[PDB]
Symmetry: D2
Subunit: 300 residues, 4 copies
């Protein structure tokens, strides 16, 4: 299988790097306006492959994306300029890779997924935004540290906007099949309001802290996008909190935000409107209205 | 790191094979009364390794378990058609009276991981005989029933079992407890998720699923004489959790002070697995019906063990 | 993608298990005249999947092999086996015409030739495990002997999977060095007696294992799974496998093992390595035996 | 187990990232003069772990290196566009003067894996300062050049690089030696295989490949400013080799008693990697031309070290 990445900056190349080491696809093609940059990243990642799996890593143009099952959109130059980028990029991608699933990372990722969606003319399940997939992973990693258990055992969700209005879903969170409060107690911890506030801050301000420390985030999302690409290429039928055009959510219509969804060869194949407290559900409504306004004020 | 396997039969060898293919340990030592059989299995599996990971697979004596971080106990008789797991108990208790001493002599720091049926009572047996802290003697328990529950639900709803969160508690046997009350997919109550998904689970459908899990070993035994691929993978995964100090959460068996009022009994509850074996236990909130079934399961295990002075 | 396995015995089930644990294919279909046996293995292996990778394991009929890109064939004995392939091969291909056929049934070289003649496929799309297991054994034994990971031992076996197989000592290397000096100091130089022990270890391996446990399946299971992975990922990796070969040391139209490139098309290329006079004569004799065995049976 | 990385720059962070995605160790500690930098990289990589493997990734002081089984030294300046690796020597020897003793306070039993360029001289600087046995101070050396040679030969032949067994020896830099003479593909001599594949490997083809290999770093730095993905995977693989006691064979750099007549010089040869670091060295099969090139390469490294008194 062949995967494409348009926008070979830090996010795109980190994604290419994860795909290569984890052997997700037999072939990865990086596309970037800066052609020497794509080539440099491609060569560097190609050179990792003898340590891991056979992957034909290379740089190319949209034409080289032919037959790609998935193409990751991580291109950026504001929402004004970014939206103009996607106007250029999307139709060129689909020209070459008609049946590819689009995976959007470019921020603000919710609004950009909707732009990608309006431009593509494909079923909404075919245009997938990374959405809160990274926030969910952050929430899990932070509960993991707090509980000192493997994040792979923590099953917690972040929904709504990949941004400031995102909703941490505490009510239905579970660890190893056990409700979060009661697992925490067994572990010797109380999840006090103070503990919660601290974990909330940890997730909500995560990107800010990393940016101020090293200028950008890319390792986290690189891995999350590689994982979604894998979900798509293997027709995994796995559940992830990703963003996609949603007919309706809490009364808000035709908006893209993250809910738990089933990912497979067709992209999003199912959406779960899950179980939230009144507090969380209202937070999700407020989040959905934030994203709605933002997209309309741009015509998408 | 070295892993020991005692009993190089179907279960033992399938576990060693999973360990090899997954590169879990750098060295796997197979120990069997029948040295030629362990030797043949070790050769056969050694020959897989050039296709996977570097693993020194070999057959050995009990002295060769030395320095093992975990030892899997898979020696002893399996149930034949018509027979329950609890019926193996007298015979396999006698085996463990031979096995456990010899293991702790060669590898006194090893975490014991028990597979031999009936696995909950055998874990208790091993615990009594070993003199070890309860955390260090772990039975596979319902880890396989939980896997079976998730897989049948996965097949039902056509989603990856990885995304299905449901588990089984109590006895690894006829009295096990499917915990429907807290099962979720995508943060949603399982029954709600299924309806939404347009394949709802009626009472009848659940009954069929309960049977799918409950009678899986009997079906498999009748069709091919034994079960071993599923438990082999499950054992390799627990060995991995221990050797990597994973702090993962699994439904496994261990000696438990008190559960629904029944005292000093080994059965499966959600537990945290790491370098020291079981490092913590959760006693989940259950529906009244599940709580009662779990009590019943525990009294059964307690009785069976007591009758032998365990 | 989908892999099919015809013959769900020890070898077929062990292959399916390896495929499942390694997450090689998304769907694995087990087919066997003994319907309950295939079902049983399918359930047993399905239950492993939550520990590893999502894989739809199930038992079925030929119609279920549909869309398979690889199908493993692991179903006077020689006469009865040939006859199995006469029943099985047509049906597999009917249901999965684009499937590469991977043959495990013994004697694997003759059965590969049998499968080839019956299938009417390009020669590259009918591949026998051949000496792939013999090569892994040669490497594993050299690995134990030198105490280095077998992955750093590149040494192979050519010819018949069986008594006439040829260990290619002449070009064996470990870290770009010739085996013999590499050992001579790793501190243990490989006498002619040591090479003889190793030869026996490889050549008699199946005998020792069958005597000890009645059958071999783990080694071949892993090897087949690996070949299935090469095929499905279009790996273009090099393996010593068996396939219909126009000419070898003068012998014509015989199936035996040589170094070959493996990809989506099955055997996509074949290397005819230079060998010592010893090895060359051995390979010829090996080819001669297989040609004769095939001819007698009418293939 | 625990791995330390000193220098949380592009190379150190990409190495940690590879370790986390491949699940090589249970804990990874990033140490850097710029603490906010290590912290940002550590958070960023921790957040990847739910998608892959459990790994406690964190930033820390030298003190937090305690108990590390290996410590990767990736601290110091990298090449500017057009700058050669040897031009970094004096600046990075001074960095190592600070780093090496501070690592060995916290983790005197750690195997050291040196990435900082010029990696051969830096390996020899680490060796002198550490007071460790030669085998325990490992430089990545030509491990990445070997990979480039394999990857470019793989493109040339259209086979998986995993099937190409060709290596690069000597300096990790302009004077490195491509060992064409003994190169094989899947057990077969390279010339023999190239022809079977429809390739005659002309002198032009060899020149092209040599340049592809020799100048890879210059090209990548010009295009994106630095290299880190290739070496990150290479370092992770070496860390894995050490932590698992692999006994794998790799071309890495270590202090070498005598090479082609040149004495007491650190440079890349095929070596066996295990828990002790380098547990064996092979002086390989070379043509007269290759041999002379290795001697010249060793001489450049010898004089560079000696001028600094190392
Ligand atoms: N969780 C998430 O969804 C998440 C997390 C982090 C960053 N992001 C983001 O994703 C994007 C990338 O981040 P980044 O740091 O890599 O930025 P980056 O600038 O480093 O890389 C961006 C690039 O896209 C390339 N590019 C721009 N326009 C292009 C076009 N029209 N065609 C081809 N290529 C084009 C640019 O040349 C450049 O290399 C941003 O929008 C950043 O905010 C998203
Ligand atoms: N879920 C589970 O916990 C689970 C699942 C399947 C099977 N099992 C149990 O596993 C046991 C083994 O099953 P099996 O199929 O592998 O049987 P097996 O007979 O095939 O193999 C068992 C073996 O143990 C060996 N052995 C016996 N006593 C020994 C001793 N003192 N020291 C060394 N080796 C000894 C025997 O020689 C034999 O090879 C049974 O109790 C079976 O019911 C448990
Ligand atoms: N390296 C090698 O190439 C290697 C190594 C080991 C075994 N083998 C060969 O593997 C083989 C199969 O071995 P095994 O151990 O699994 O034996 P096995 O008997 O256990 O299984 C073989 C099976 O084929 C099934 N089968 C037979 N005829 C069938 C038909 N026409 N349609 C579908 N299914 C049918 C049988 O029911 C049975 O289950 C033997 O030929 C064996 O010698 C090869
Ligand atoms: N194959 C190879 O051997 C290879 C390949 C590529 C790069 N490298 C190299 O490795 C080094 C790093 O490259 P880079 O790109 O990461 O550079 P970088 O500048 O991005 O990161 C280097 C860092 O070292 C940290 N550091 C410096 N001195 C320190 C000290 N006393 N203690 C703790 N931390 C300290 C610095 O703060 C900085 O973060 C260079 O020498 C570069 O050439 C080697």
């Amino acid at each position: 299988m062949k995967v494409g990445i348009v926008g070979s900056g830090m996010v795109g190349s980190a994604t290419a790097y994860a795909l290569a080491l984890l052997g997700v696809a037999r072939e990865v093609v990086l596309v970037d306006l800066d052609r020497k940059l794509a080539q440099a990243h491609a060569e560097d990642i190609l050179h990792a492959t003898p340590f891991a799996h056979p992957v034909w890593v290379r740089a190319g143009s949209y034409g080289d994306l032919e037959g790609a099952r998935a193409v990751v959109l991580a291109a950026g130059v504001l929402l004004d300029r970014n939206a103009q980028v996607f106007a250029q990029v999307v139709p060129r991608v689909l020209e070459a890779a008609p049946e590819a699933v689009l995976l959007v990372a470019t921020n603000p990722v919710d609004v950009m997924t909707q732009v990608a969606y309006r431009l593509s003319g494909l079923p909404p399940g075919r245009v997938v935004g990374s959405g809160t997939i990274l926030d969910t992973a952050r929430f899990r990693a932070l509960l993991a540290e707090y509980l000192r258990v493997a994040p792979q055992s923590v099953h917690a969700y972040v929904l709504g906007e990949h941004g400031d209005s995102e909703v941490l879903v505490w009510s239905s969170a579970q660890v190893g099949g056990v409700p979060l409060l009661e697992f925490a107690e067994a572990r010797g911890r109380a999840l006090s309001p103070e503990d919660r506030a601290r974990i909330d801050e940890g997730v909500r301000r995560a990107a800010y802290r990393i940016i101020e420390g090293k200028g950008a985030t890319y390792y986290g999302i690189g891995a999350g996008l590689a994982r979604l690409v894998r979900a798509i290429l293997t027709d995994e039928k796995g559940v992830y909190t990703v963003s996609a055009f949603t007919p309706e959510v809490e009364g808000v219509l035709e908006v893209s935000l993250s809910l738990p969804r089933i990912l497979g060869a067709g992209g999003v194949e199912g959406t779960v409107y899950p179980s939230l407290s009144p507090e969380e559900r209202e937070a999700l409504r407020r989040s959905a209205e934030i994203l709605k306004e933002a997209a309309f004020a741009l015509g998408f």
